């Protein structure tokens, strides 16, 4: 399809193309060089920010990474089928915009506790 070609598609179909959008996230006299240079390092900063956020969740180097954080029903009481069959990514972004930071913190504390207790258990053995 191409870049952003599944934006209007459903969730399940848009999950099938994810690498072509991850491609664009990096891509790649005295004033215009400054402007191009600034916007390139800006895009590099966003890519490093997203990669760091992925790394802090234990999902580095992966596109779809599962997490042992339970899904709170207060975030969304909708069951799986209407999320994954007749819904787009934008509408889900709109509904779960208010709970993004809480989900992010739950992921980071889950990954950090997993690392800490893995260290604690593996030192016993």
């Amino acid at each position: 399809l191409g870049f952003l070609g599944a934006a209007g598609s459903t969730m399940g179909a848009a999950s099938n193309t994810l690498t072509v959008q991850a491609r664009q996230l990096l891509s790649g006299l005295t004033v215009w060089g400054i402007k191009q240079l600034q916007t390139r390092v800006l895009a590099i900063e966003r890519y490093l920010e997203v990669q760091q956020l992925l790394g802090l969740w234990g999902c580095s180097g992966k596109l779809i990474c599962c997490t042992a954080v339970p899904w709170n029903s207060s975030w969304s009481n909708k069951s799986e089928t209407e999320i994954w069959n007749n819904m787009t990514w934008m509408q889900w972004d709109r509904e779960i915009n208010n709970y993004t930071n809480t989900i992010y913190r739950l992921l980071e504390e889950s990954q950090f506790q997993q690392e800490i207790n893995e260290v604690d258990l593996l030192a016993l053995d």
Binding site: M11, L26, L42, L63, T67
Partner: protein
Amino acid sequence: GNLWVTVYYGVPVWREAKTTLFCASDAKAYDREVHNVWATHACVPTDPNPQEIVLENVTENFNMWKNDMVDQMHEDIISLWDQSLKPCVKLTPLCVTLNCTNVTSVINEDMKNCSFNATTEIRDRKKEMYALFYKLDIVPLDGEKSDNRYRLINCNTSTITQACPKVSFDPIPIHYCTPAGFAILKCNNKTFNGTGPCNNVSTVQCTHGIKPVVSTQLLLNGSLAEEDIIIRSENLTNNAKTIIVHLNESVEIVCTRPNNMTRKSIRIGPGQTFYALNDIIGDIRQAHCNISEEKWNNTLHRVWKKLVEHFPNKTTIRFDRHSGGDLEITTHSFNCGGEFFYCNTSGLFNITYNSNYTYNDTKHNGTKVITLPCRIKQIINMWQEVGRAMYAPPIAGNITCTSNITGLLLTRDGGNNSTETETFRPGGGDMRDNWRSELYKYKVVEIKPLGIAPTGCKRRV
């Protein structure tokens, strides 16, 4: 029944953005042709076989009047103008007393033969040179006597840097490209009126190569419409907003300067020299533009029909000339072949249309044209915030250009109560509106590839 948080990378969502873009000139523009004002070598080569990806089942909200790309383009054009005017010779020593007289042939009544003392290569002797200067560029000294003593117009406001002898004003397409992590959304809706929803929006990497044509009251060499005339305004009931009429059939306008003029180099100082007009070979004819009467009748009739659709209960709609002010706003100002033209538009916008006449089909053919007179300046001061004007170089031979008017920068008059009449006059406000005639479909969107989705998959311990 249990569910878990799942992370997705490469998610196709976006929000609004105000990121800085970077230019991209065409690859054919790099075939030498150096030292043009809009030719920027810092622009990257245009991407071959560019892609536009149609996004189905999605609707996006656009707004031309809140776009940041127009402001970025205006600032970029201003600083490019500054960079092009920076290096070459300034005419500060040319601010001297000019002994001006009539130009020998009938009287031209547009140029004056002015003699002045200019320093030679040594700054201790001065030679009495002469040149032909337009009357719009020379202000008479004092103002109460016929002493035939004049001076340049901006000898008391700022400095003049004469345009370098090789420079050219030919516009080239400029493809504004968005960085990584950002995309450009283009509204393919052919009916689209400049703002609101758009049900057919496609994602692109770069724009369509917008030509930076500088013009007032008219849109030259612009993209045409697709279905019908599209009237665009931020707020129609507000009279301060400028209506940008978008035509669907561009009208050919042919402009010319039939006079043949000679160029002579004059030394104004040590290491400083500029080119000036010397003589007029042949007869003297006033420069003018020709627009077909029937095609303009078609355009005015269609524009009046659309303005009747947008303004109900108004019995009469009058197209009159501009109100008043300086010559740069009262006349159609453009550049043909390196020469700046200021053309009177009183013959174009002069009509009264009422709803009670059918006005036929404006048929019965004809080759009659509208000869609108034009004047030529050389001391050009556009985008006055820069603080530096120009002395445009003289051009030998005639100049003849053929362009297309593809839009009108109309402007409604002030509040004259509910008298069932509104008079629309040509505008000529800020130049940003001109770029807004081209960036009416492009918006910049900021990609978020990180997404959260519940799935019954649990990560192992």
